[PDB]
Amino acid sequence: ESAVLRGFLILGKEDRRYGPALSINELSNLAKGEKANVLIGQGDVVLVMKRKRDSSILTDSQTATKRIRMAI
């Protein structure tokens, strides 16, 4: 359990918006950037998020999606 949970940050008590509690084994397959409730040893359910976190997708630094051809 400890080894699996090292990959997650515990955010607090069970939050039903994130669905039924997973087992620790089910949690170990959770994707990056995701949250879930997990049943931890023993009896308590907590909300966790994976420590590998996905792109911010900073629109400010993105380049233009389209280009107009101006006169030279």
Partner: peptide, 16 residues
């Protein structure tokens, strides 16, 4: 600023 931010984000995923 955005380079520093994404570099630090990158570091956070390496220390994970």
């Amino acid at each position: 600023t955005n380079i520093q931010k994404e570099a630090t984000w990158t570091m956070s995923n390496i220390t994970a």
